[PDB]
Structures are given as C-alpha cells and as structure tokens.
Design a protein around this ligand. Structure first.
Ligand SMILES: Nc1ncnc2c1ncn2[C@@H]1O[C@H](CSCC[C@H](N)C(=O)O)[C@@H](O)[C@H]1O
Ligand SMILES: Nc1ncnc2c1ncn2[C@@H]1O[C@H](CSCC[C@H](N)C(=O)O)[C@@H](O)[C@H]1O
Lengths: 357, 357
C-alpha cells in the first residue's frame, strides 16, 4: 500500500465528523421533511420554513446534492429528494435512531478516547456529566438524555435481530431461561413470544435500577405470569437454577479477563447438559473484509464511550474461551451482512454451547 | 441513486467520528512512534511502553491493520508499519496538525451544528468556552487551546501557499498595497519579503485591537519603514490611496450580501485601474467531483465551528460578484493538482480583477 494512498485515506478520515453532522443536522433542522413534503422549494423558502438563513440552508444541502441524496435545479434553485426519495420511512427511522445514538453517546466523548485508553476510565462522561467511576450502563439511571438515546437504539437493534436469534436457538417445553444483561426485559418478552410453552419461565438479569421498567414492559406485552426480573451485578454471581442462559450484546463490552469471569459464572449457574446461547458482534477472520464495519466503530465506542475496556473478538476467539470455561460448542453462525439492511453497522454471530465441565 | 446505495452511504457517514479518533488516538497514545522506533513489538510490550492495557492497544490498532497502515503477524502478534512506512516525516506532521485542529475546533462543537445553523451563532463555542458572541477569530485571544490548535496551523499553511500566491500576483515598483483583514501583519511582512522594490508601501487593515501586535511584528521583522497599520471595520469603508488590495482567506467568512458590500467598499477605495487579488477556497463547478473535499468539510466548519455563517463559493460565483461590483477579471486559477499533497482538504483559487466602474 502506497504512501500517497495512505495520505489520501487520512483526508477521508478527516472529513468524518463534518460529514456525519452535516447529514444529521439536515434531518434535525427539518430540511429533509420540508423537501419531501413540499417538492421544489428554494433555499429562501426552506430557510423561512425551518427558521434559518437561506445561505446556511444552501451550504448544508451542498453535501446532500454531492452524494445524490438531494437534487438541485440550477435554473430555478429548486430542491427535490433524489436518493432519499425511495428510502422507506421505516428504514430512515432505523438509520436516524443509530445516528442520534452516536451523536449523544459517542461524538463529544470521542475527544477524550486517548485519556480513556490511558486510564481505563470514561473521561468523556467525566468531562460532560461529572461521572467519576463505572460505565455508561451505570450512569444512565441518573442521565435521561444518555438513557433515552442508548436505550431506544439497543431496543430497536434487538427487535430487528431477535427473530433470527430465536429461529436459530433451541428452547424446549417448560425450560427455565435466564436472559443475562436483559436490560428492561425485551429479550425475555421475545423468548415468550417465539417459545410459548406450558411451564416456560424466563428471567431478565440486569442492574437493579431496571426493575420498575422491566415489570412494566412485562405488563404491557401481557407476559407478567411467565417473565420475572433479578437485579444485580454479573461479577457478584449468575442466578442459579436455569436450563438455558441467553447472552445478547454483552460479551463485546469486556476484555478477555471479564468475559472469562462471566462464562465461569454462567458455568457455575448451570448443570451438566445446560445450554448457553450468545449473540455478539464478531470481527471477521480476515480483518481487511469491507462487508463488516464492526472494527470501524466498536473499539472506539467501548474504550472511549461506554466501558473504558472491551470490544468484539473473532468468532474463533469466543469459541476458544467457551472451551476454556467447560463448554462444548454445538452451533456457530455468522449473519450474512448482505441479508441485513445496508445502514446497519453491527454484524452478529450466534454461538450455542453445552456445559460438560 | 438507489435506496440501497443511500443506506450504505449512511453507514459510511455513521463510522466517520469513530474512524477519525481511532486513527488520531493511535498517534496521540504514541503507538505509531513505538511501532516505527521498535518494529515487531506485541500489544503487551506496546501497552507497557505507552501505559495502557494490551487489550486496548490490540483493539485500537485493528482498524489501522484493516486499512493496511500497519501489519500484524498472526504467529508472533508482532506489529510493524505497512502503508505508514514510506510516508515522509513532514507529510505526517502536516496531516496530524490538521487532524489536531479538527479535534480541537470542530469535533465537540459540531454536536451543536443544528443550533448554530438556527441562531447564526457558534453554540459549540458558547457551550464549551462560555463565548457569548462573535467568531473563532475573536475568541482566540482569551482561549489557549483554540489559539494553539488553529492560530499556529494557519501560519504554517500560510507559509506553504504564500509562495504560490505572490508568484501569481503583479506588484510593480512603488505600489501602495492594502492587505485587507491582514490580522497582525504577517501578510504585509510576506508581501515586503516577496515584492521588495523602491517605494513599496504595504498597510495591514484589520480591527483596532490588532494595531499594537501589528506595529510590533513590523519592528521585529525589520519592515517598520515599509509597513503600517490602519484600524477599522471593512463594512464602515476601505481606506483610500491604494493601487492594489490583497484579500486572502476573508471572503469565505461571509454570505453573498456581505461579500458584495466588501467588494463595493474595495471598489469605492480604488481609482479606475486599481487592482484586487483574492485567494479563497472554491467549490468545483460540478459539485459531484470527488477530488474536491471542500463541501464535505467547510459548510459545517464555517456555520458550526468558526463563523456561524459564510462558506466557500464556486469560482464562477466569485467572478460574477466581481463583475457586478464594477471589476474586470484578468486571472482565475486553481493550484496545480499534482503539486498538492493528497492529505490536504482546501482547494484554493486566486482571482485578480481591475476596477473599470
Ligand atoms: N455489571 C453488569 N451486570 C449486569 N448487567 C450489566 C452490567 N454492566 C452492564 N450491564 C447491562 O448489560 C446490557 C448491555 S446492552 C444489551 C441489552 C440486551 N441483552 C439486548 O441485547 O438488547 C445493559 O442492559 C446493561 O445494563
Ligand atoms: N469587519 C471586519 N473588518 C476588518 N477585519 C475584520 C472584520 N471581521 C473580521 N476581520 C478580521 O478578519 C481576519 C480573518 S483571519 C484570516 C485572514 C488573513 N488575511 C490571513 O490570510 O491569514 C481576522 O484577523 C479578523 O480580525
């Protein structure tokens, strides 16, 4: 790879921040809605509609014309949607929810990635919110803006991927299922929806503060009889007396040492023949693969923004760590990136394993 | 532009901030220096040297391996420079200085681009530095981290592009030259250095609070006899008695109506045959062009980070505005593309015009 190709790629990297917010601000300002709802307005007409100078509107829309999202008639000054014309409202809501989460959880916090990587602490959250200890997950109880941006997304990501998950995981009649780090219970609710059987019991395990929201989630989905909540810290111990443990979007938050503690805990909580089903973003075996954006996002996201440690691993590393912790792998499935909508960053693997210890 | 293609481009926009800081942090941490100075070190050894966990070093370098900037040996876990190996010391220092400026001036402030666009003010600058009104240019004097990141870098890029400017502008013997928005007089000093001739007089025109810093710069560079300062607002009129007005990196700070007012003010200050020489970033006449990164960067940078208004224009726009303000264009040039390093964002134009009123 050339020195001049390297310097060219640096420039692509340098315009990342300005590109990201130019596009998001065009949605936040209401410009895209105005252009969709009223085809053929000028910068002056759009400016009056959204409460901004026409000259500001003109400049910010230039990048959307360059990318072919929006078209501009040179003669009239008129704007219409181009690329964005045929994007379904559902697809755009998904993408904007992820972009909003990055803006709130990552954009400003990333300034302090270096200091975060040096201390193994979240300097971003320290500087912005005055949080001195722990993770984003510990702080969202106290910080409404952080909780809504992160929670709404995680729940959209989970609603979209879990049909695939439950289609590839075995939950037999009358199973006792633990959803480890199950947040406000959507994972447990999905278990009941897809695996409804007589005697089926599902429990959400997460931070004690999630309890009231979890119980209300169960009530709202009509599954309060078959779903329950245990509050705690995974590092204090995994609840005992389950047949099957689900671990969805959790192991990638942690370095090996803590992943090993989680899986050793999960082992102690299971009988021989008890099962664990893991869904986690994985790096590909060949890191140069362009169909997988996990490495372009998560290292900086976990180290600088949410944890102060962690990041995904190759499916082979997770398979190895399960084997070190007294489990035998029965399933390993990587999601086809071309079968996921092209706006979605995470590429997940499913790993199923049986305790043999 | 298809729906599918639009959503894929959204994914490319979303990973921009994480990509940007992952690369910069790898330099800030000292990981690139350690890998260059000590080839074949592991993540553990690199981690001991910089004061970060091996697990953190591993995760942050993965993206550099994906891009081929750095190579990783499966067997030994050894890191060497790849793409970055043949990149000149001087090229990297320029790239890193510009990236550092974007980190300090743009990264956090862009969070508030929407609010900055609605109010015509720098909400970022207010949120972080308590600056109630005005521009990045005003706020530099009282704030050290902005001054060092932005002010120092401007001087360096000034000195690299000034030879091309003065090499393309006609300043005959005995010329009376006004440097419009000449700041603290560097532009006037550089004019004297490049065009030294019998009877050459060069005046810096800027806000009064620069008069003292300018007079001292002239003394120190030994050009007090050739260079003076005149304090004023350009919108209250341009000083008379000048043959040539230089306008470098000023016009892009304003919207059309204000640009017209400056060019009319310059026209009123000149006799028929008086000359103006503008240097300004330009948008390409075909805005879809990928060699020109001005639209990916400047709309958000001006509106969100530096001015709360303004931005570049097409060279054709600036030429039409000069002709509207009683000027005849004699020269309109861009820099030889091949002589511009591929890391450099701003595409510069020079336009020369003669008052014909
Ligand atoms: N020490 C800890 N013990 C238990 N849960 C924890 C934890 N640290 C973080 N968590 C939880 O881990 C979850 C990670 S996000 C994943 C949520 C859910 N499994 C899903 O896939 O949608 C959050 O709900 C967070 O509160
Ligand atoms: N209304 C106004 N009248 C005169 N100078 C102004 C002005 N508004 C801003 N300025 C000046 O515009 C300058 C822009 S700094 C960059 C321009 C400089 N000629 C260079 O090439 O480096 C600042 O020095 C600022 O003080």
């Amino acid at each position: 790879m050339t020195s001049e190709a390297t310097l060219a790629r640096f420039r692509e990297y340098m315009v990342g921040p300005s590109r990201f917010m130019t596009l998001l601000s065009c949605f936040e300002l209401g410009l895209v809605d105005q252009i969709r709802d009223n085809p053929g307005l000028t910068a002056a007409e759009l400016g009056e509609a959204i409460g901004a100078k026409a000259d500001a509107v003109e400049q910010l829309l230039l990048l959307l014309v360059k990318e072919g999202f929006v078209a501009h008639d040179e003669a009239s000054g008129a704007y219409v949607l181009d690329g964005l014309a045929d994007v379904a409202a559902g697809d755009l809501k998904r993408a904007l929810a992820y972009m909003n989460m990055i803006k709130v959880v990552a954009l400003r916090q990333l300034f302090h990635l270096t200091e975060s990587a040096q201390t193994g602490t979240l300097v971003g959250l320290k500087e912005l919110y005055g949080v001195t200890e722990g993770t984003l997950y510990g702080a969202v109880a106290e910080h409404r803006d952080l909780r809504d941006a992160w929670s709404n997304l995680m729940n959209t990501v989970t609603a979209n991927i879990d049909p695939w998950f439950f289609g590839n995981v075995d939950v037999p009649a009358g199973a006792r299922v633990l959803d480890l780090a199950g947040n406000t219970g959507l994972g447990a609710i999905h278990t009941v929806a897809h695996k409804a059987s007589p005697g089926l019991q599902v429990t959400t395990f997460d931070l004690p503060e999630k309890e009231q929201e979890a119980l209300a989630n169960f009530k709202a989905h009509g599954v309060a009889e078959s779903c329950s909540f245990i509050g705690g810290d995974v590092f204090d111990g995994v609840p005992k007396g389950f047949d099957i443990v689900l671990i969805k979007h959790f192991l990638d938050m942690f370095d090996k040492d803590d992943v090993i503690r989680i899986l050793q805990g999960v082992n102690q909580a299971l009988e021989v023949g008890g099962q664990v089903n893991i869904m986690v973003p994985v790096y590909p075996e060949d890191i140069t693969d362009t169909d997988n954006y996990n490495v372009d996002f998560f290292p900086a996201f976990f180290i600088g923004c949410t944890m102060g440690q962690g990041g995904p691993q190759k499916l082979s590393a997770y398979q190895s760590w399960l084997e070190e912790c007294g489990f035998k792998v029965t399933k390993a499935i990587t999601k086809n990136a071309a079968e996921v909508p092209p706006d979605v960053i995470p590429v997940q693997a499913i790993i199923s394993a049986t305790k043999v210890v």
